[PDB]
Amino acid sequence: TRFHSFSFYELKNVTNNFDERPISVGGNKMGEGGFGVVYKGYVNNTTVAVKKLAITTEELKQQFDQEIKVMAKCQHENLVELLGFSSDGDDLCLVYVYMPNGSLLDRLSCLDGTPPLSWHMRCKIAQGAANGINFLHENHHIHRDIKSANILLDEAFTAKISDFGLARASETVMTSRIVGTTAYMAPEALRGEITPKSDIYSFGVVLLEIITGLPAVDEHREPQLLLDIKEEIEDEEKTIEDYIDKKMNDADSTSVEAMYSVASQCLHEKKNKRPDIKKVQQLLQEMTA
Amino acid sequence: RFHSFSFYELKNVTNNFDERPGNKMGEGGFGVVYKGYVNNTTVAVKKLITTEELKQQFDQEIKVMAKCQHENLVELLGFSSDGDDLCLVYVYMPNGSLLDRLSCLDGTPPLSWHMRCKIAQGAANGINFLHENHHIHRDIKSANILLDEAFTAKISDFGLARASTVMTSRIVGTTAYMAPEALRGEITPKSDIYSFGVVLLEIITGLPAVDEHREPQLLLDIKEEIEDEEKTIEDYIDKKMNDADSTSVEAMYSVASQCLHEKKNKRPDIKKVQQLLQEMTAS
Amino acid sequence: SDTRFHSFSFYELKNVTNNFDERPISVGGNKMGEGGFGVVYKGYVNNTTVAVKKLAKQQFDQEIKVMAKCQHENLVELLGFSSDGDDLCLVYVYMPNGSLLDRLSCLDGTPPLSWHMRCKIAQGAANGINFLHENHHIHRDIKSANILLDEAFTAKISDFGLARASTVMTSRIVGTTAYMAPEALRGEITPKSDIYSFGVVLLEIITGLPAVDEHREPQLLLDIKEEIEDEEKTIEDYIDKKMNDADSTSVEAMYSVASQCLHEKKNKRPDIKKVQQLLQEMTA
Amino acid sequence: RFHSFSFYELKNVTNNFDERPISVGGNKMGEGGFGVVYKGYVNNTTVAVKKLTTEELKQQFDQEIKVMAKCQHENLVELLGFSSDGDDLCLVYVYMPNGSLLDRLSCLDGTPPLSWHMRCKIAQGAANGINFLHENHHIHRDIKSANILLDEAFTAKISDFGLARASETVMTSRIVGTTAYMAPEALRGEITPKSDIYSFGVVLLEIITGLPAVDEHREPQLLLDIKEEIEDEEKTIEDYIDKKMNDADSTSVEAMYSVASQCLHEKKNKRPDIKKVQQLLQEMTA
Numbered sequence A: 001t002r003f004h005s006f007s008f009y010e011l012k013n014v015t016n017n018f019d020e021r022p023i024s025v026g027g028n029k030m031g032e033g034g035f036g037v038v039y040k041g042y043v044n045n046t047t048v049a050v051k052k053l054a055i056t057t058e059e060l061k062q063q064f065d066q067e068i069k070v071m072a073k074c075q076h077e078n079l080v081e082l083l084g085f086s087s088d089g090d091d092l093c094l095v096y097v098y099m100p101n102g103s104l105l106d107r108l109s110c111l112d113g114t115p116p117l118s119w120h121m122r123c124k125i126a127q128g129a130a131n132g133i134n135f136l137h138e139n140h141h142i143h144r145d146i147k148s149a150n151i152l153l154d155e156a157f158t159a160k161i162s163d164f165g166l167a168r169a170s171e172t173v174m175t176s177r178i179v180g181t182t183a184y185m186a187p188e189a190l191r192g193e194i195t196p197k198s199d200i201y202s203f204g205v206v207l208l209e210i211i212t213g214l215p216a217v218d219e220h221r222e223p224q225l226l227l228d229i230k231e232e233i234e235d236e237e238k239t240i241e242d243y244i245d246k247k248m249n250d251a252d253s254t255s256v257e258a259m260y261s262v263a264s265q266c267l268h269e270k271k272n273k274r275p276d277i278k279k280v281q282q283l284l285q286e287m288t289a
Numbered sequence B: 001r002f003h004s005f006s007f008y009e010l011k012n013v014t015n016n017f018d019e020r021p022g023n024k025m026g027e028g029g030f031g032v033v034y035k036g037y038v039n040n041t042t043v044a045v046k047k048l049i050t051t052e053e054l055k056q057q058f059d060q061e062i063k064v065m066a067k068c069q070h071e072n073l074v075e076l077l078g079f080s081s082d083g084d085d086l087c088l089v090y091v092y093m094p095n096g097s098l099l100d101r102l103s104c105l106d107g108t109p110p111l112s113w114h115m116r117c118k119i120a121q122g123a124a125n126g127i128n129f130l131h132e133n134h135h136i137h138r139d140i141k142s143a144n145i146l147l148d149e150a151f152t153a154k155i156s157d158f159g160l161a162r163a164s165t166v167m168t169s170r171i172v173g174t175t176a177y178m179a180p181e182a183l184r185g186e187i188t189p190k191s192d193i194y195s196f197g198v199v200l201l202e203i204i205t206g207l208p209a210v211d212e213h214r215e216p217q218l219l220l221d222i223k224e225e226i227e228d229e230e231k232t233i234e235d236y237i238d239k240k241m242n243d244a245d246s247t248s249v250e251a252m253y254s255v256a257s258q259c260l261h262e263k264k265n266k267r268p269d270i271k272k273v274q275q276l277l278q279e280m281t282a283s
Numbered sequence C: 001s002d003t004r005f006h007s008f009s010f011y012e013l014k015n016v017t018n019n020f021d022e023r024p025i026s027v028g029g030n031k032m033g034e035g036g037f038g039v040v041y042k043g044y045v046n047n048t049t050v051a052v053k054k055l056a057k058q059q060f061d062q063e064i065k066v067m068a069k070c071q072h073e074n075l076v077e078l079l080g081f082s083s084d085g086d087d088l089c090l091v092y093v094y095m096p097n098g099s100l101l102d103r104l105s106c107l108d109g110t111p112p113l114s115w116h117m118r119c120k121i122a123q124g125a126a127n128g129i130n131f132l133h134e135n136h137h138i139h140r141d142i143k144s145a146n147i148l149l150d151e152a153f154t155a156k157i158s159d160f161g162l163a164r165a166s167t168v169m170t171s172r173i174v175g176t177t178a179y180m181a182p183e184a185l186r187g188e189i190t191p192k193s194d195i196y197s198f199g200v201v202l203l204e205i206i207t208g209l210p211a212v213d214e215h216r217e218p219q220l221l222l223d224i225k226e227e228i229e230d231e232e233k234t235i236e237d238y239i240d241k242k243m244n245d246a247d248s249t250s251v252e253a254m255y256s257v258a259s260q261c262l263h264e265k266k267n268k269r270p271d272i273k274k275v276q277q278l279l280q281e282m283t284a
Numbered sequence D: 001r002f003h004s005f006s007f008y009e010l011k012n013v014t015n016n017f018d019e020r021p022i023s024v025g026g027n028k029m030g031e032g033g034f035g036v037v038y039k040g041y042v043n044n045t046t047v048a049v050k051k052l053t054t055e056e057l058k059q060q061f062d063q064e065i066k067v068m069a070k071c072q073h074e075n076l077v078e079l080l081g082f083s084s085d086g087d088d089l090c091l092v093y094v095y096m097p098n099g100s101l102l103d104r105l106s107c108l109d110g111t112p113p114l115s116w117h118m119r120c121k122i123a124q125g126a127a128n129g130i131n132f133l134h135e136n137h138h139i140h141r142d143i144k145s146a147n148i149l150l151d152e153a154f155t156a157k158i159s160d161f162g163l164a165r166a167s168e169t170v171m172t173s174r175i176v177g178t179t180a181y182m183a184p185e186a187l188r189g190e191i192t193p194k195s196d197i198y199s200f201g202v203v204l205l206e207i208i209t210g211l212p213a214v215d216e217h218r219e220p221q222l223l224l225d226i227k228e229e230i231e232d233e234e235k236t237i238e239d240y241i242d243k244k245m246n247d248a249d250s251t252s253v254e255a256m257y258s259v260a261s262q263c264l265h266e267k268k269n270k271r272p273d274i275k276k277v278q279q280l281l282q283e284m285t286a
């Protein structure tokens, strides 16, 4: 697949000179992303998302081409679509289809006054995110930064996996540059292994965010790491019922426990005992049914 | 794909379709709408010219809702084709219709100008999605804009909807909201724009599109009264608001006026309506 | 003050009403409404919100005299006046929920009055009229714009500029047409005219409709009495739809009182005491 | 003044006082001060029914009726009636369709976050309620977000006067209230309206942050403590602002915080009286 080539000055124009104030107070910045800031833009009659990158100039320019290459290969309804890029100006820009409901993280926390996601939407988002990861793994790609901040939500709350700057081919390797987000990372990934099984672990953490509405890490909390509640639940002090996000009216026990069962399996500490993504899809399908 | 229900599950969940205000929430497009509880989810169940036509607007609705999923459209959860009657099941809208909130029915407080602007933008995003996907609603009106827990606008009732100018023998819709061409049997998305213009006047004035005990009886007519400078839009602003500034109201009115152009071809398309409604909250 | 009648200077009142700013309070002004032969502004004296009536009337003195005599929990309190300056001012305790008319129409975004509050307001307004009649005063302009509502939605009758001690006749027929008894429209002055006007207020309370609407059928709210007695419609059909808590039995009981109040023969109307009793029995 | 109900009418209309939550098909809406609160339908009116040794409970029954008879204001929940005749003692109130401020601050059961604009209105309204109580020489003794109810228009209504007292400083043996909201002196048995001011200050911090007054799984566990963290300049109020708002400007938030800070003065006598709190909250809007 080949993409539209934009000039920097069109993107500068349509993002109001890359206005770094939030959209809520009249600016253009929607979020800070993987190695770059994400601005809102209007090209033609289309709202778009423009990522301006901002490790070193060698590495950033390398994760520019990686992203384009992976997005050229990987097109699926549960992955964010790349519209284009810009190499010519000062900074390197990537241009995406606009996701009007932002990230799952932000909707889980009801940021900027948005209403809480129903259990029904949450189930759809979980199934969708898993279809996206399944497509990546079937096509021998490892994401390496699965987390709620990288699951975007469109006009219909369809889940879209985003940020393939870190992504790799399959077609277990090791690396010196350990990258990702600590609170979502599998033990092996924290030690430099690169395997699709790390993606499964991180998805398990996402499923706990979906059930509880709690962020993966909160410095002002006990436990500070959301994965730890798996331990608290297995040692029967608490139950999953006790952690269910209280900002839902429509969550039945049976379906929540079924999603938890999937998350628990995804969070197995031995990489080899985790289910593969296909098993995760199937289990998430059976949950609805 | 949607959950396929048996009639007896829906009968169970609506307390045998209890027609007291009970389980009945309202009368809808060619059917009655009941409240239901499946698991811990509140839902809306619509139980449904001739025997040929109703069964035809059943499949139309499912087909359109299969294609059309958007945050500003009511979501179809499922249906039931067995049993005596045909049932459609939807996500429950705890704030009911815009018409009812505009009239403060059952003691609900008046919508602020701020919510009104959000509802207008939301309804237009819904219509835009329908038109982009080559669907014409044909019955845009405040009774078919539903409001969720956060007052997000949801377009509903796609029984009359059509794929994409044609003509017809069966002229359908709501008279007080209809464009002249639609009243003569044309079928175009431009008729939806006109009807949206009427909705925007309901939002600004809080008046229903038609009141038998009124002058003018048709809300559209105030456009004429305003253009011939006897009155101004300021004079029609819903008095049940404290937070409506002139500039933003006049900007919404400007959009409604353009939507209500009598020549279909001079009306703006829905995309232009979105843009104009966005600029109103800035600018 | 707190136990006294304050004599105010014009310049204090001018100061505290922002030079009598005639823009509405909603858009940052001081005007709250137009009243009986004057405009009513919001004011701040000390830490007290107040209502200042500048006339827009000659019979300034009537109002002061009647308010000096007539003090009751269901009548607005006069705090003071000002006879110096250009204009004549009357100063009242501020009524934070405004007029019944404005709350019936949900003006400025206020929520609809429940049936429960409506019943309390009806009973309260009648206690006020009863106090006036017991003390041999006739109001002459009973209407929903002259029933004010305090912090607790207690009804307070206001505007005694037209009041008399509360049968007499007159040349200057005064009042509000849509609320007026036939005899009052012909110049009679009797407390029985107050009862008739109260009956109209009770219909506003039940229906939420104003006494007169030029864009309506019937244009005069009184007329629904006829439409109901000739069995085309029923009172159930006119109940304000902006209520969730109105039961038929209590609404019909209030209507029964309004119907009796609206008898066209002044002598067949109940006196205010009977109206109180009937409104008490209604609660339930 | 109040409608007298028979127990069996109230039993009927609350589905035999079904103590399961409304979410799982029951009638219980919450636990109150020495009683449970159920949902009920009498005539066409939704209502709230509070079902409460024999001497003390029957004494807080008459206290509540007596205080509610005296204290009527738009920012206080209205008593509709009572029932003395059955097994248990019942109090019946106007139904508050938006529940408690606590529950709306936490977006319980999927309700959307309160805007800063509504939050300011709720704060002003709650203070008008407390001001009415203090002007009439009543002390609430359990001011907290669970006892500020919200009607169809999000008007604040102070509720639960079972613990309330006349003025209109006394002491007591039975120390009552909610620990996380209580002034130091109230925790030691003093009874003064100044304790109400302190508790209101905590409510204002809940409004600004959206955090509950106490969370066992948190640091600090007591919301009051953020006052210390802010005064010792590690953090600022900006850092604690509820992120579930789009419309909160710094200037107005800092002004509400200034009021809360003053309300939370540890020396009871340096706290502002409720009238000063109203004025400051008025100036904040603007």
Ligand SMILES: Cc1cc(-c2nc(C(=O)Nc3cc4oc(N5CCOCC5)nc4nc3N3CC[C@@H](O)C3)co2)ccn1
Pocket: A030, A031, A032, A033, A034, A038, A048, A049, A051, A080, A096, A097, A098, A099, A100, A101, A102, A103, A112, A114, A149, A152, A162, A163, A164
């Ligand atoms: C890092 C990255 C991002 C993307 C990519 N991003 C978008 C995109 O459209 N994003 C986006 C849109 C938003 O719209 C709102 N709105 C405010 C709340 O109410 C509703 C409206 N917030 C939003 N926040 C967003 N953030 C920005 C980065 C991330 O935190 C998600 C599309 O691709 C692609 C590849 N790599």
Ligand SMILES: Cc1cc(-c2nc(C(=O)Nc3cc4oc(N5CCOCC5)nc4nc3N3CC[C@@H](O)C3)co2)ccn1
Pocket: B025, B026, B027, B028, B029, B033, B043, B044, B046, B074, B090, B091, B092, B093, B094, B095, B096, B097, B106, B143, B144, B146, B156, B157, B158
């Ligand atoms: C015709 C049609 C309707 C729908 C569809 N309808 C709903 C739905 O939830 N409906 C609904 C919900 C309501 O909730 C309340 N409130 C409760 C709180 O207090 C104030 C009253 N009123 C309500 N009225 C409703 N009406 C029922 C008739 C229709 O005009 C909308 C959802 O899909 C779909 C497709 N075709």
Ligand SMILES: Cc1cc(-c2nc(C(=O)Nc3cc4oc(N5CCOCC5)nc4nc3N3CC[C@@H](O)C3)co2)ccn1
Pocket: C032, C033, C034, C035, C036, C040, C050, C051, C053, C076, C092, C093, C094, C095, C096, C097, C098, C099, C108, C110, C145, C146, C148, C158, C159, C160
């Ligand atoms: C004619 C006359 C008037 C008075 C007298 N008037 C007030 C007084 O306080 N009045 C008043 C208060 C108000 O408070 C609000 N609100 C604030 C909350 O939000 C919604 C707006 N609106 C209001 N309007 C008012 N008007 C004034 C004309 C009358 O139709 C009602 C007190 O005595 C006395 C003797 N003769």
Ligand SMILES: Cc1cc(-c2nc(C(=O)Nc3cc4oc(N5CCOCC5)nc4nc3N3CC[C@@H](O)C3)co2)ccn1
Pocket: D029, D030, D031, D032, D033, D037, D047, D048, D050, D077, D093, D094, D095, D096, D097, D098, D099, D100, D108, D109, D111, D146, D149, D159, D160, D161
């Ligand atoms: C202790 C006490 C209470 C009352 C008194 N209580 C109500 C009342 O109406 N209460 C109430 C209503 C509610 O409505 C919802 N809903 C869920 C969210 O969506 C909207 C609907 N939750 C609700 N919770 C309530 N509780 C009551 C205890 C407290 O936890 C809050 C009225 O007087 C009076 C005197 N002493």
